[PDB]
Symmetry: none
Subunit: 165 residues, 4 copies
């Protein structure tokens, strides 16, 4: 299952926060925000709160949010998936939390390896995820249409959602 | 404060699935509460005898509340969901809870309250001494007996009929 | 005398509380509640009271109750047969009391062996009687139609009686 | 949504006994027995008993059972979804219970209209389900492969399962 031969995110699969394998074609026809999250980061609260806000105002517009806990940046996500799932519930998170994952390097999940090279998924000084809370906007056809940096608070994405709803 | 509670039914625990369980649910049932561990020398003898007790007395009001704990030789290392599948291998049908602490300051309130009850006092101190200490909880949530880590669960059987 | 081949309780005989053998085919045409009883159990008062009540109200509808003393559970029926008869009289029982028997093990009465292997009389984890005051509902043809555990108060059976009158 | 254009059971959705919509696509890769059930029919006991035994013995091989309560046959499913769920729990039902559904006529669920016209789901005279506990054997790809009459006990299906496991 080589990852460079992928046309859409719908072609991948991911374990949710409870270990069950989730096929990503369940987001066909939905606009998604994929982000790597961290519990002990300096921008955890602004991201988790703003994502819950965007999920609430735009859920019935078809907006889904996919949080992928990652540890490769400053070790800011050290707990287990149940500790993270509880941490997310502390923000009233009602979108989809997935299991901890690597986003950079060779052990990175094939999805992240795919998204990092996409025309709108490529980074500035290299395509690597630079820190926690890098955001990717994915359209209804499971295609990367933009990438937001770790400082960019989730509400900067709202002005772009109408182009893909 | 846990020091002033009058019953087990005043506390609440994470079940091993993460959801909160009001132990008031056990009002009217006879309960064996025990701190469990899967890498203990008495892990096999305790899980099988507790399963046997549950199979033969759940129809009598016997509930079993297994609380995983890693504080005794580090013999319960795994996560909750890992512990659940270990318990399932023994065909456990009683109630499994989340890994807690039983001793020290990080210990769960319920067990802090249990270790000071009249029938819950140890011989020298009150701290739970090893894996698989059992507490017999009556129909009203009161500690009526405590069994050492080396007393096999079938020893409790002779004490159950007086409390059904 | 192979109890496995019986198709009805009417095929069996039972010593009553006064010592005289009783052919159970005398119950053909009546709906029967058979229960193992004990005088020193925690659920003794509630069971005797509700069985007497069910008997007082449904004897005119064909309800018969067969109380079988058993001492195999916490040794909660230690008295003699004539002592059990006196204690029973204290509740003004008018249904039928029998001699103390065993309901489990090799020495179990052939009726209880047959009753525990019936489709509607089977147990959860094994067919053995778990404790005092297990109830079995028996139809007019002597066939087990339902089994009730020792917690279940006798009035729980009331909602099932009209189907068999 | 025209049911005549479906090629598989997986293209339909049902309300489970608890009211939650269930994507029948979730049964992809499993062998399914779909049957219309009732609690007061003359064959209720034999079907619930044998389906539970079939499910427990063959869930290890991918056998699922979909029970669709239907009241169109002698009015023998009059209770509510919670009453039906409680009745099925009385038989230790561990397979999937669904909400009460019409299986015949205009108001029938689209899944059952599709099933009756399948080449292997057609009846002897007409395709309409003609009594409670009609069984449809459904293969991994959600195609009807055999239909069993109401009077046929569920255990007659056991000999057919190896062909589709």
């Amino acid at each position: 299952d080589d990852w460079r031969c992928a046309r859409s995110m719908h072609e991948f699969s991911l374990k949710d926060i409870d270990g069950h394998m989730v096929n990503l074609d369940k987001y066909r026809g939905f606009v998604c925000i994929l982000t790597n999250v961290a519990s002990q980061c300096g921008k955890t609260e602004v991201n988790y709160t703003q994502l819950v806000d965007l999920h609430a105002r735009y859920a019935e517009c078809g907006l889904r949010i996919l949080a992928l806990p990652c540890n490769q940046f400053g070790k800011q996500e050290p707990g287990s998936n149940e500790e993270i799932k509880e941490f997310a519930a502390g923000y009233n998170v009602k979108f989809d939390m997935f299991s901890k994952v690597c986003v950079n390097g060779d052990d990175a999940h094939p999805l992240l390896k795919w998204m990092k090279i996409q025309p709108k998924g490529k980074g500035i000084l290299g395509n690597a995820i630079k820190w926690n809370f890098t955001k990717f906007l994915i359209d209804k056809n499971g295609c990367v249409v933009k990438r937001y940096g770790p400082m960019e608070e989730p509400l900067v994405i709202e002005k772009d959602l109408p182009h893909y709803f």
